[model samples]
Target: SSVPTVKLFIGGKFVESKSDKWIDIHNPATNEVIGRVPQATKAEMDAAIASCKRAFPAWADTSVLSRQQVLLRYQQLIKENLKEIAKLITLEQGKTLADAEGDVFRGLQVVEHACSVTSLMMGETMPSITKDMDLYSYRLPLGVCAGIAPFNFPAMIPLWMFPMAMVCGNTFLMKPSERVPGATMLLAKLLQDSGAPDGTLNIIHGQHEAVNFICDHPDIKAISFVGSNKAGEYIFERGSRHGKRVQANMGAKNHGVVMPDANKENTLNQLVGAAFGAAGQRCMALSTAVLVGEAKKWLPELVEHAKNLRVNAGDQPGADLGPLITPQAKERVCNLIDSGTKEGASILLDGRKIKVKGYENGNFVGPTIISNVKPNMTCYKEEIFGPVLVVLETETLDEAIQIVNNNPYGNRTAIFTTNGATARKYAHLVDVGQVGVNVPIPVPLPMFFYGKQGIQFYTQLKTITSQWKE
Candidate 1:
């Protein structure tokens, strides 16, 4: 067991937490204690907040060109060391190397997008609303802002929040997932290398106590959250109660419906990646599949193929999947499998007790498939963050769409069909925030509106033109 050593970044300087108590970190692949990070105290949170506040004026006053330059340099540095950073995320977060690299790449894309902040932040010129009268508007930094990113995207989500916020000239305070805080620290160092001013960006590791302090603190001006709906709502309500801008992106039980006329091969390939890829830990992973009447014939085959999706630890080359972050996730997933069985859904390709060869107890579970699930079952209602796919049979596409709308989550949904009319209709009618047509996952790139479940109140970069003076 390798012990992890970590530090807190306040005012851009690395410092140890006041308390000596440390939480043991682990390598999910082997369940070995890999390292430790201080359980940050409230004082540490206050200090980080204070640092962000102090740095705000200077960063905000700096010209857009200078900000872009700093971010450009930072972007280059990240690109240079992307492989190493991705490897670290994989080692700690238990995602596959490929997935980790994908996360890092997504973050880098945001940085690249942030490099255009000069234009994005430029004021908009509005033509006269009244004769001979004109008005213009420009974006201003919102002072100190805080980001709470989830563990599934240890590298990418932080990159998404911090780089854009900082480049827009606001000071940033990040509380990344305690499960894998090292990536945030590494990102802070990368920003330092890019000549980011001290206190402009800080990364701290802590528990809920740390989060509450930021939410209640007066100095932290805005809040961005990516996590479960319960916590997102908590942060949004608490932060907004204090009059700060809030964006809370909570949870989702995303749906991917296969229409009768859809290309089974194309759709199945997409489903393989969307459902079981990354061990189904992604928030936007399509956990439920709704099969319309014409598509029902191939549902069983598709489910079997999804169940056969490979699972492996990151150390092995050519590994198709990686372990979940904790033993609890494994246990919870297994427990859910039992619940599904008891609820009377037929377990077509049961995955409750898969023991990977030469990797027993590796925090890994193979893909699972359940069919004959009713609309009201637990598997149908919850976001099972595992490689477990539920199949719902519908007599018509309208019923399939209806089934999707009845769910509580509105994060993401998809429709697979050759009919342009149906695809266009689903795009307009679905309640999900993100919609995919003829695609398994509908996530947009950085240039597009990139996010999983966009219940998020805070968001990415760019600008729009004004039509007239206000």
Candidate 2:
């Protein structure tokens, strides 16, 4: 039996790619070929864009109620197939089954939010401005949006980009990570079956060629991306240069500050899940732990907890961690581990030699802990993007705040403390888009991840004013 080839979803149909180019999909747990996805050609990309351009008027003209109903139907269908989606995610992306289902559920939350487009899309009207004058505005859609997703949360990230765009009356072109493409194709089909018109949603698969085409294409009016800082910066610069709406969510080096007065048990538990869960592949993963005052005393217990994390294939029950996305991913993580040690950081637990029984071929990097890490160190400066957490000791909360604010990436940060005053002050001072007081992973429901930066990232607001003569 051979692995199936996943097809491109275009114009409400799934069809074979025009090009013979293909990218192999892998089961990260067993390191076996599971399927292949097309390396969509320029013609195919152009055709998908044209289909969306053709369908935009109808989709944009759709009644808000009708749009909401269609999205609701799509959500219901996803609910029916949730288990299958979760399995596909686990198989390809290498997160545990529980984590994979959690991704699906998070994606479902976005769809559920989109189903209320009737209220969400409501525009405002005001009268009696200046002698019988009036003002009104409608939140309009930018036509033919494109989403370039990452490998971390295949189902959830796509849902985050598309459902909102669709409900806002925009057609979309989804370019999911080639590493994990099957689940997106499946979702696109279900979307079509749920009453999204032809060209309202499309999926293209490839690496740089496909991405560059989408960025440069005139028909694609907006581009939503979630990837590394370099790629995000590139997309933002290039996409915006092309006069398109770009939401390029880039890399993150998230931090968790533990104060002297924090709840030790709760803080440590949250840190374990936030740092090591999903193998530290999440953009919002707590990679750096800033210990303030007496908080550094908990380091030994933290190291013990990290060392005991159960590593196994994603399908196995009770597996706390899984393999990285690819062999290259494992290698990159290992290189960073080497860099950390060379930079004089004390390695409390070395995970480089981690081996799981019955799955020696899998790309696994066990949970690692490093202490006495300084901001100047390479491990602390760069996003390692693995199950490695660095501890930075600070004497005061002020020093911790300064450390977080000085970092370039402003995605998210959290402060764990029992004092409301400390939490409020920390929340106020941090420059990141999202803040977590007691919560380690402060990923809010649906749209809150973007915050002020996200609002400007995802949508553009327009204003209208008119005068009436009576």
Candidate 3:
């Protein structure tokens, strides 16, 4: 009963809630109820949204240089408090301390990117179109933008949403996944300490009802969501019905092709980490490995790598990964593995029954690998958000590419090869949104997303055509 119940972050202050219902937050490495978060009352929700609505005008009108200056301070503050933030993440989210540090560091990079908002948000100019006139476009902010962050990567995902949205002169309302609210709470406190304006960023916690309120609320002009495909579809449909612009990042069974010519050691090094790192809970995790022809010979070595990974509490120094996010997550992952075997796939290394001494109740699922998996199997089709890997063996590079394209998700894919021609061809022809050549997780650098994927899902553009009479 003494655990801290997470408070509502509104108008740059943490406030207590009057809700009658609350959810317990757990440490997956040990089934301990470390905290609780309330299901916000409707008035509380309105209060959170309205605070931003009232504050949006001034914050959006604030100069970009001034806004970026705040981000610079915020960035340094995060670096200084990096280990503390990482500990919070490991305490609640159950990623190893080393991995948790990476999570905060990547989010910090986005904040650093926001420091360049002045140049990144620059608009095009034309001296004259038809007469003695000049025209320039403006990348303006949408009012009171909102985000629905997922449980995995709590700090990193929410950081991906707000920093850019606020940096673009817009206010933001974020509803972090209730399960892992600790990292977000700590980050919110750090943000307020950075001297950002009151109500420029707000956070609330709840389940479905709260999420729908944001979707239907007229004051919110746009949305940025990250969750499962089922959840993404629901948010996109509901938010679009209200005429709000929704940018939804959903689940994926990301694939990496191990071509025959791939450097033996390089392929194994990346393949194992990409599959099991962060316990395979990442949306961009390379859950499926497509082995082409002679590359199948590397399967035994791959299994050994997965077997050798050390699993324990995230705070432990030598632990490679901790546990699944919750007991239910562990159950779901184990069930998916069972289905894969019943459908004829072979479980090379089963981890369903792994137990950590003194923490037997922890929701741990050791690294698992299933080979001979087919397109029709449950494990291959559904996202196994746990430390499990599915292997699909194919005859040629063309077939491997087809398997990736055939999946409903077009998120990310990579190919490991020493041959420049093969790598170039894979990069060119892969239909996925992101591709990596000899890289494990092919995440785009901050500046790389300036095209149709402009800055992020945070800003909108307005073009101007002008004529002047001299």
Give lDDT for model 2. 0.83
lDDT tens digits, residues 1-470, model 3?
67778899999679988799999988898788899999898999899988999899999889889898888888898999999999988998888999888888889887776676678777889898666877888888878888887675788877777887878888889999889888888888988999998999888898898889999999998888777888888999999999988877666667989898878887897888888988888777788999998999998999887788988989887898888888999989888898898999999999999988767899988889899999989988898888898999999888888888898876777898889999888877778767888887777332213333645456777888878685
- Candidate 3 ranges with C-alpha deviation above 4 Å: 444-452, 455-457, 466-470
TM-score of 1: 0.92
Spell out the clash pairs found in candidate 2: none
Best by TM-score: 3
Residue 162, model 1: Cα distance from true site in angstroms: 0.6
Q: Which runs of model 1 end up more than 4 angstroms from their true locations?
A: 125-135, 444-470
- Report the error of model 3 at residue 408, Å: 1.9
RMSD of each: 4.0, 2.1, 2.0
lDDT of 1: 0.78
lDDT of 1 by residue, 1-470 (tens): 35747888998689978765677788888888877888788778777777887888888889878888988998899999988898888889888788888888878877776666555455556677567666665556667878886565787777777777776678888888888988888888888988989989877787787788888888887777777778879998998899888876677678889888978887888887888888888777777888888787887678766756777788678787888888999999999989989999988887667787767867998878888899889888877888888988989877887888888767778888899998888877777767888766665342222332221223233344445435
lDDT values for all models: 0.78, 0.83, 0.84
